[PDB]
Design a protein around this ligand. Structure first.
Ligand SMILES: CN1c2c([nH]c(N)nc2=O)NC[C@@H]1CNc1ccc(C(=O)N[C@@H](CCC(=O)N[C@@H](CCC(=O)O)C(=O)O)C(=O)O)cc1
Ligand SMILES: Nc1nc2c(ncn2[C@@H]2O[C@H](COP(=O)(O)OP(=O)(O)OP(=O)(O)O)[C@@H](O)[C@H]2O)c(=O)[nH]1
Ligand SMILES: Nc1ncnc2c1ncn2[C@@H]1O[C@H](COP(=O)(O)OP(=O)(O)OP(=O)(O)O)[C@@H](O)[C@H]1O
Ligand SMILES: [Mg+2]
Length: 387
């Protein structure tokens, strides 16, 4: 007997899609969390700009600057951090100070929350994440921007830390590409990567936008590296977003669904680790662009995807952004223990899907396919006998 799994995957209630898509409680909870961080980040920058504006008018001692800082939200930084902030503001150039007084922090969400691939967590320790980037409109720079890299990082840290001090169960964590607020009890964390963009082009596009009811020069979108050798690196997140969105248009609405399923499979096989979300997306896109498939039957499509995935990761997965210094996934001749473990799981997937298809009953078919996605869908009646 052959079983069809289309309803198993796509049913918005009892199906896998029904288990992966965020509830209104979780979705609005993430939006509220993002709103709080955006408000605080802007308020913190205004407080810092207020101190700098006082400096501009009447010359203040470094002593007075440090006491002003201690009263603001910057106080939630360490004593050494508070002092450097007061030092940077005090030792700031006259021309550099004018640039800062006009600094306007902007925000734009990237990642799965933006292109709607965000799944509900499965195993303990797994969390939902919002990738809300902060943009700093400044003049184009080559090496070091007008407004210091150190100052921008500290002010963002102060904003995040000030929110942690106001919430039990919240914790701050610094990664290489962003600052992070972790909410363990809610299985949630928000990442805040900082970018530098051309102020002139930003104002231009903003003026045209408001009058019409717009991506800037990609080479001038600089990501701030916290612990890296380089303070800045040209990493435009818009490249990945446009790539995936264009792929969804080119391939169809079933692309986001199958991408969710592979990520759910990833969450089921590893409590932590496994292939990156972007690597799964890129590989899946390559398959649906090269191999014929039927969107009306995502059960067959997933089988087709699982069949070709191992060869995709073996070849190595190229990044949608050619600017990337590394591929999303290494080729076979560069595989270590980590990649071999991933290859082992990938080769196992198609066997699991086939086994579930040849099960003796709906009940048996459910638990077999649940080997790939874990126990989420409990309704075996979603599985129908193949015509
Ligand atoms: C990203 N971007 C980008 C560009 N170009 C290139 N090459 N790379 C880039 O990364 N161009 C545009 C943008 C960079 N420039 C801008 C970034 C942010 C803003 C701005 O006014 N943001 C608003 C919020 C936008 C939002 O919530 N938006 C919502 C969308 C609507 C909603 O969710 O309700 C959201 O963030 O989810 C704000 O700061 O309050 C204005 C311009
Ligand atoms: N160019 C480039 N961008 C990346 C890479 N990895 C992550 N990013 C960016 O970082 C953002 C967040 O990526 P992830 O959180 O790992 O992927 P995701 O789609 O959010 O997956 P989940 O977080 O598991 O839902 C993405 O929107 C990408 O733009 C990479 O290797 N190259
Ligand atoms: N090439 C890149 N360019 C810009 N940002 C990136 C890039 N790769 C990852 N990021 C950022 O890092 C986050 C992805 O996290 P990563 O894959 O580094 O593991 P992690 O979440 O740091 O692991 P852990 O949760 O154990 O700290 C994304 O939210 C993204 O904003
Ligand atoms: Mg993410």
């Amino acid at each position: 007997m052959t079983w069809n799994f289309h309803q198993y995957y796509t049913n918005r209630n009892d199906g896998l899609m029904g288990k992966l898509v965020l509830t209104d409680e979780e979705k609005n909870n993430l939006k509220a969390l993002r709103k709080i961080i955006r408000l605080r980040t802007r308020d913190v920058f205004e407080e810092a700009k207020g101190i700098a504006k006082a400096v501009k008018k009447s010359a203040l001692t470094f002593e007075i600057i440090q006491e002003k800082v201690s009263t603001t939200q910057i106080k939630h930084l360490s004593d050494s951090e508070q002092r450097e902030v007061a030092k940077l503001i005090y030792e700031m150039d006259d021309d550099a100070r004018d640039e800062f007084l006009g600094l306007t922090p902007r925000f734009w969400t990237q990642g799965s929350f933006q292109y709607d691939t965000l799944n509900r967590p499965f195993q303990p320790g797994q969390e939902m994440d919002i990738d809300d980037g902060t943009y700093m409109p400044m003049p184009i720079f080559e090496s070091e921007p007008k407004i210091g890299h150190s100052l921008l990082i500290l002010l963002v840290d102060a904003s995040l830390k000030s929110l942690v001090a106001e919430n039990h169960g919240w914790k701050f964590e610094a990664k290489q590409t962003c600052g992070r607020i972790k909410i363990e009890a809610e299985k949630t964390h928000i990442n805040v990567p900082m970018y530098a963009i051309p102020k002139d082009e930003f104002q231009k596009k903003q003026i045209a936008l408001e009058a019409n009811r717009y991506e800037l020069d990609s080479e001038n979108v600089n990501l701030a590296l916290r612990e890296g050798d380089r303070k800045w690196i040209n990493s435009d997140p818009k490249i990945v977003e446009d790539w995936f969105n264009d792929s969804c248009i080119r391939i169809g609405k079933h692309l986001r669904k199958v991408c969710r399923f592979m990520k759910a499979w990833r969450d089921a096989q590893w409590d932590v680790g496994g292939p990156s979300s972007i690597s799964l997306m890129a590989a899946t896109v390559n398959i649906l662009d090269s191999v014929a498939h039927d969107a009306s039957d995502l059960g067959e499509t997933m089988k087709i995807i699982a069949k070709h995935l191992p060869s995709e990761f073996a070849r190595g997965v190229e990044s949608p952004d050619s600017t990337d210094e590394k591929p999303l996934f290494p080729p076979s001749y560069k595989h270590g223990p980590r990649e071999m473990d991933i290859m082992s799981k990938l080769e196992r997937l198609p066997e699991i899907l086939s086994s579930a298809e040849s099960a003796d009953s709906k009940s048996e078919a459910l638990k077999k396919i649940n080997m790939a996605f874990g126990n989420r869908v409990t309704n075996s009646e979603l599985i129908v006998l193949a015509k």
